[PDB]
Design a protein around this ligand. Sequence first.
Ligand SMILES: OC[C@H]1O[C@@H](O[C@H]2[C@H](O)[C@@H](O)[C@H](O[C@H]3[C@H](O)[C@@H](O)[C@H](O[C@H]4[C@H](O)[C@@H](O)[C@H](O[C@H]5[C@H](O)[C@@H](O)[C@H](O[C@H]6[C@H](O)[C@@H](O)[C@@H](O)O[C@@H]6CO)O[C@@H]5CO)O[C@@H]4CO)O[C@@H]3CO)O[C@@H]2CO)[C@H](O)[C@@H](O)[C@@H]1O
Length: 142
Amino acid sequence: NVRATYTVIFKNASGLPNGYDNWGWGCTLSYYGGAMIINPQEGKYGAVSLKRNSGSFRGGSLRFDMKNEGKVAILVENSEADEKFEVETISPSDEYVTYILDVDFDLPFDRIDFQDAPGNGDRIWIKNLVHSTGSADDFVDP
Ligand SMILES: OC[C@H]1O[C@@H](O[C@H]2[C@H](O)[C@@H](O)[C@H](O[C@H]3[C@H](O)[C@@H](O)[C@H](O[C@H]4[C@H](O)[C@@H](O)[C@H](O[C@H]5[C@H](O)[C@@H](O)[C@H](O[C@H]6[C@H](O)[C@@H](O)[C@@H](O)O[C@@H]6CO)O[C@@H]5CO)O[C@@H]4CO)O[C@@H]3CO)O[C@@H]2CO)[C@H](O)[C@@H](O)[C@@H]1O
């Protein structure tokens, strides 16, 4: 079977996704309108860090809808190795945009981070977060 595995982490969020803890820092999270809303603290470069409690992801791509007042760094991490990887930094947008990003990290990852890169407290809204084991080019949106 050469088709990808698509993991819908959350569609509309009314809390953390079942199977995930938050190992984030320097922010508060709220949930409204199906969005996970990150409110980072000024000067903390805060982030949500969704930690898959059991198991890991490998390579593939990350898909999500986001709007954001400031630049957002997308990272993944391997908690066993304590190794992080910067996937992309996304510029501000006042409207939701769908991103599909290749993850070229070559260790498995069990943490997915959305970070307030400028450290200015700019808010971030996320919906419809999905991992695919396949490439962004080959992604068909579940
Ligand atoms: O309780 C559950 C569980 O916890 C376990 O411990 C976890 C913990 O929960 C978790 O929060 C912690 O997470 C780490 C994470 O692993 C690291 O990757 C992350 O690293 C951050 C760092 O904290 C930030 O300071 C840094 O911010 C940088 C930024 O990267 C850089 O771009 C920015 O540059 C500025 C520059 O300084 C200016 O001069 C200018 O040029 O502008 C630029 C851009 O604005 O500077 C920032 C400040 O330096 O980012 C990195 C990367 O994200 O840190 C977090 C928090 O510590 O991980 C631990 C595990 O190790 C327990 O172990 C377990 O028992 C328990 O159950």
